[PDB]
Design a protein around this ligand. Structure first.
Ligand SMILES: CC(C)CN(C[C@@H](O)[C@H](Cc1ccccc1)NC(=O)O[C@H]1CO[C@H]2OCC[C@H]21)S(=O)(=O)c1ccc([C@@H](O)CO)cc1
Lengths: 99, 99
């Protein structure tokens, strides 16, 4: 679809077999989701945002469906203010900015 | 134009008589610019993201040019690590997400 930006670009995602709402975030390199249970192995990592750095659990090669488009990539889990879909997955679903 | 997301969507902007590089950021409600000494009145504000909150100065009705597209709206000035063009101005230049 074509998404205008008068409202937050919030979409439904499916990850680990669960539905969630997430923000399509072109300013994020990486995808960061709020605390949740995910199967498989993870590794502790750090990520920085506008306010500083947080500790996250990095899950690699995770299947995630975004607004009906499939991606498989890295997902960071930690105390982010909101679920954000970053460019690592936005590229996989073919997302571009247009004006 | 059309901007793919393999790399950060950085564009040149013109604000307060200065040229700067800024992210086209669908994940930001507002526009947040690195510290600069703009004239006029402002209101204090706090905005939060990954890592917590930063203190910014809210200026209203600021003229900004984004890739030759003119806009006018609110800009928040503070210690952000990157210049962020948020949805309040992205709508004014006709920017959409497409996949
Ligand atoms: C977290 C989002 C919900 C919100 N943010 C926008 C995001 O695009 C942010 C931009 C960014 C990019 C580089 C450094 C710092 C910030 N990207 C980000 O944190 O990405 C993380 C994950 O991937 C990595 O790559 C870059 C960093 C890592 S915010 O700046 O904090 C923010 C908060 C409140 C407002 C108010 O106007 C109300 O919205 C406006 C903007």
């Amino acid at each position: 679809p074509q998404i205008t930006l008068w409202k937050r670009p919030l979409v439904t995602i499916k990850i680990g077999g669960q539905l969630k709402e997430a923000l399509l975030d072109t300013g994020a390199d990486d995808t960061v989701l709020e605390e949740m249970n995910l199967p498989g192995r993870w590794k502790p990592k750090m990520i920085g945002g506008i306010g500083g750095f947080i500790k996250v659990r990095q899950y690699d090669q995770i299947l995630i469906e975004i607004c009906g488009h499939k991606a498989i990539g890295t997902v960071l889990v930690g105390p982010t203010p909101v679920n954000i879909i970053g460019r690592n997955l936005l590229t996989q679903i073919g997302c571009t900015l247009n004006f």
